Design a protein around this ligand. Structure first.
Ligand SMILES: *[C@H](CCCCCCCCCCCC)O[C@@H]1[C@H](O)[C@@H](COP(=O)(O)OP(=O)(O)OC[C@H]2O[C@@H](n3cnc4c(N)ncnc43)[C@H](O)[C@@H]2O)O[C@@H]1S
Ligand SMILES: [Zn+2]
Lengths: 5, 298
C-alpha cells in the first residue's frame, strides 16, 4: 500500500 | 485477546517504568518520526514556522505538498534536490532519544523500531537490520529509476551530486538516480508489512516519539497492538487521538482511558526522564557522551 496524507 | 485490561498501575511515566521492569514487559516497539531528529538539526515537517511545510516558498512549486510527491518528482526532480542540498547536514549525530532506543536494543527489550525518518540516525546510533524498519525508506542508498537497470549508489555518491547541484544520473544508463525514500504516492517497503503482521501479535509496550501521526499507513500502526498493550507518547503535543467526526485511537484523557500515557515535552528530555526511572540514566549519559565525542573526532 501507498504513502498518503 | 481483544479484551481491554489495565496493565499499568497508573497512567504516568512512573507507571510505564514499573511496567517495563516487570516480567510482563518483554517486547517493546518504538514508532518514531521527525521530532526525534529536530535536536540533531533536521527540521520536522509540520511544526509551525520551523517545519519544512512553512519553508518552501523559495522552491517555486505549484503547491507546497508537491516537493514530497512522486508524480511531481518525476516531472521535475530539481526542486527536491535543491531542498536536499539545503537540509543535508555536515555531521550525522544521533540524539539522546536515538541512544535510548540503542539501550532498549542492548537490554534485549527492542522488538522493532519503525521509523518514518530518512536521515540514517537510527543506524548510526547502532540499530541494525534485525531491529529497524525504515518505513519511509532512507537516504543511505539510492537507485537508478530505470526498471531494467536499478543500479545502486551509496550515500557518498549521492551527497557529491547534491552538493555539486548536478541532477544525479546513472553511470550505466543515464537515467535519474533517486534516494531510496518513499515519496507520497509510492508503495512502502515490503518488510514494513511483513514485520507489522508478526510484530504486533506479540508487542508488550508501544513507545511513540516525535510524530504527529498524520501520514498513513504508518499512523495506523498504533491500532495494530493488542488492546491491553500500553502506549506511551513522548512528544511536544498530544497526537493520535481519534477525530471527533471521522471516528484504536489514543485515549489519554477520557473517562474510559486505561492504557495510553502522554509525556509532553522534548523527546530527549522524556527519554532521559524515563531512563532515570529505569536506573539507566548514567548508562545513557555515558553512551551519548562517548558516541558524540567519537563522531566529533571524525
Ligand atoms: C515522507 C518522506 C519525505 C522525505 C523528504 C526528504 C527531504 C530531503 C531530506 C534531505 C536530508 C538528507 C539526509 O514522509 C515524511 C514524514 O516521514 C511524514 C511523517 O511526518 P512526522 O510525523 O515524522 O513529522 P511531523 O513534522 O508531522 O511531526 C513531528 C512531531 O514531532 C513533534 N516534535 C518536533 N520536535 C520535537 C522534539 N524535539 N521533541 C518532541 N516532539 C517534537 C511535533 O510537535 C510533531 O508532533 O511526513 C513527511 S511527508
Ligand atoms: Zn541505470
Amino acid at each position: 500500500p501507498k504513502k498518503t496524507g | 485477546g481483544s479484551q481491554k485490561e489495565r496493565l499499568l498501575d497508573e497512567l504516568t511515566l512512573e507507571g510505564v517504568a514499573r511496567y517495563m521492569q516487570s516480567e510482563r514487559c518483554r517486547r517493546v516497539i518504538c514508532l518514531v518520526g521527525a521530532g526525534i531528529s529536530t535536536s540533531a538539526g533536521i527540521p520536522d515537517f509540520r511544526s509551525p514556522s520551523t517545519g519544512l511545510y512553512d519553508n518552501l516558498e523559495k522552491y517555486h512549486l505549484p503547491y507546497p505538498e508537491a516537493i514530497f510527491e512522486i508524480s511531481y518528482f518525476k516531472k521535475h526532480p530539481e526542486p527536491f534536490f535543491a531542498l536536499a542540498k539545503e537540509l543535508y547536514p555536515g555531521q550525522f549525530k544521533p540524539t539522546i532519544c536515538h541512544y535510548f532506543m540503542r539501550l532498549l536494543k542492548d537490554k534485549g527489550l527492542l522488538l522493532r523500531c519503525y521509523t518514518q525518518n530518512i536521515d540514517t540516525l537510527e543506524r548510526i546510533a547502532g540499530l541494525e537490520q534485525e531491529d529497524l524498519v525504515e518505513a519511509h525508506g532512507t537516504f543511505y542508498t539510492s537507485h537508478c529509476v530505470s526498471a531494467s537497470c536499478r543500479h545502486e549508489y551509496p550515500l557518498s555518491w549521492m551527497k557529491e551530486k547534491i552538493f555539486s547541484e548536478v541532477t544525479p544520473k546513472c553511470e550505466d544508463c543515464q537515467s535519474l538516480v533517486k534516494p531510496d525514500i518513499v515519496f507520497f504516492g509510492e508503495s512502502l517497503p515490503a518488510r514494513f508489512f511483513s514485520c507489522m503482521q508478526s510484530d504486533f501479535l506479540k508487542v508488550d509496550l508501544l513507545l511513540v516519539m516525535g510524530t504527529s501521526l498524520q501520514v498513513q499507513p504508518f499512523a495506523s500502526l498504533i491500532s495494530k497492538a493488542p488492546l491491553s498493550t500500553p502506549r506511551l507518547l513522548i512528544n511536544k503535543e498530544k497526537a493520535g487521538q481519534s477525530d471527533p467526526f471521522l471516528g484504536g485511537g489514543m485515549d489519554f484523557d477520557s473517562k474510559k482511558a486505561y492504557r495510553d500515557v502522554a509525556w509532553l515535552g522534548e523527546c530527549d528530555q522524556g527519554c532521559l526522564a524515563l531512563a532515570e526511572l529505569l536506573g539507566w540514566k548514567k548508562e545513557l549519559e555515558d553512551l551519548v557522551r562517548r558516541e558524540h565525542a567519537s563522531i566529533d573526532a571524525q
